[PDB]
Amino acid sequence: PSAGSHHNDKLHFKKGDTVIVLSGKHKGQTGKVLLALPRDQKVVVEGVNVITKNVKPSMTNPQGGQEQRELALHASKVALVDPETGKATRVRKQIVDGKKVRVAVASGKT
């Protein structure tokens, strides 16, 4: 059945990080990474929004409503930023948290 993501199941960003869409609608928009889904390659962000009319199941709501909620994307929001736009990024060095590498583009860290 088609198989899942081919990106070696590797997300290019954490759930913490700020990020910007670089394609489709919402290109240029930015937000925090509210949900990362590496194996399915999917990214929750406060950018994309969608009005999900959950079907009324009277589950405390006899008549149903229409919630406004953000609908996830994938490796099309671009990674972290720093000179105010998306960037390719590189593994760095040790810090006072010396067990860690950070990131940079043509610049500093994230």
Partner RNA sequence: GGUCAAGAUAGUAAGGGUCCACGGUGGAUGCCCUGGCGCUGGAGCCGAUGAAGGACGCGAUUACCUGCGAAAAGCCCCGACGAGCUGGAGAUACGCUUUGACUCGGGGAUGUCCGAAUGGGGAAACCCACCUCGUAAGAGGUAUCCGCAAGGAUGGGAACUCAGGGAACUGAAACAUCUCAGUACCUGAAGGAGAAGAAAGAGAAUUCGAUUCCGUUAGUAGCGGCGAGCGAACCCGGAUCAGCCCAAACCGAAACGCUUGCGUUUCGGGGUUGUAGGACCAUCAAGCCGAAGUGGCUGGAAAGCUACACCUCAGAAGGUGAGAGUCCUGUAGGCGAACGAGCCUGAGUAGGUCGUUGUUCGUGAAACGAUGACUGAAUCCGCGCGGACCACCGCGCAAGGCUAAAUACUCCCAGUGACCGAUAGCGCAUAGUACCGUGAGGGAAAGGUGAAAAGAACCCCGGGAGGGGAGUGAAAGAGAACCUGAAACCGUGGACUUACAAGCAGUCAUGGCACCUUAUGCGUGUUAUGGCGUGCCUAUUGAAGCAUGAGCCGGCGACUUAGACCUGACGUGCGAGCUUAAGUUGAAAAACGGAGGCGGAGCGAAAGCGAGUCCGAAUAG
Partner RNA sequence: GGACCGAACCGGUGCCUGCUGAAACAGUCUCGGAUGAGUUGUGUUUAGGAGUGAAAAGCUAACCGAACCUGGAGAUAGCUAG
Partner RNA sequence: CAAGUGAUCUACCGAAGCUAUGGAUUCAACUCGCGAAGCGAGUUGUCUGGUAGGGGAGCGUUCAGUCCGCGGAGAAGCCAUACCGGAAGGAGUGGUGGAGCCGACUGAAGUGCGGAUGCCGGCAUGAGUAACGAUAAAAGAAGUGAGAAUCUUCUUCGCCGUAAGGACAAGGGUUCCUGGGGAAGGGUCGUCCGCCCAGGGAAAGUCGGGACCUAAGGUGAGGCCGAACGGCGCAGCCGAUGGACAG
Partner RNA sequence: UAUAGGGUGUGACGCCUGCCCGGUGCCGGAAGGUCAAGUGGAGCGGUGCAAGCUGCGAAAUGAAGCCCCGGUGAACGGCGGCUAAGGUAGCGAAAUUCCUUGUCGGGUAAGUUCCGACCUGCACGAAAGGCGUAACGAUCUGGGCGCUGUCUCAACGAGGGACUCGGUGAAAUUGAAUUGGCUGUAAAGAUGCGGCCUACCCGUAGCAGGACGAAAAGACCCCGUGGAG
Whole-number Å distance between alpha carbons of 100 and 109: 12
Instruction: Tell me if 94 contacts RNA by CB under 7 A.
Output: no
**Which residues are CB-contacts of 47 (< 8 A; sequence separation ≥ 6)?**
21, 26, 29, 30, 31, 70, 73, 77
Instruction: Tell me if 39 contacts RNA by CB under 7 A.
Output: yes
Instruction: Tell me if 68 contacts RNA by CB under 7 A.
Output: no
Instruction: Tell me if 108 contacts RNA by CB under 7 A.
Output: no
Q: Is the dihedral of CA 73, 76, 79, 81 positive or negative?
A: negative
The residue among 68, 80, 104, 69 whose CA lies nearest residue 22 is 80
Near RNA in 4-33, by CB under 7 A? 5-8, 10-15, 22-27, 33
Instruction: Tell me if 81 contacts RNA by CB under 7 A.
Output: no
Contacting residues toward RNA, per CB under 7 A: 1-3, 5-8, 10-15, 22-27, 33, 35-39, 41-42, 50-56, 63-66, 71-76, 78-79, 85-91, 99, 101, 106
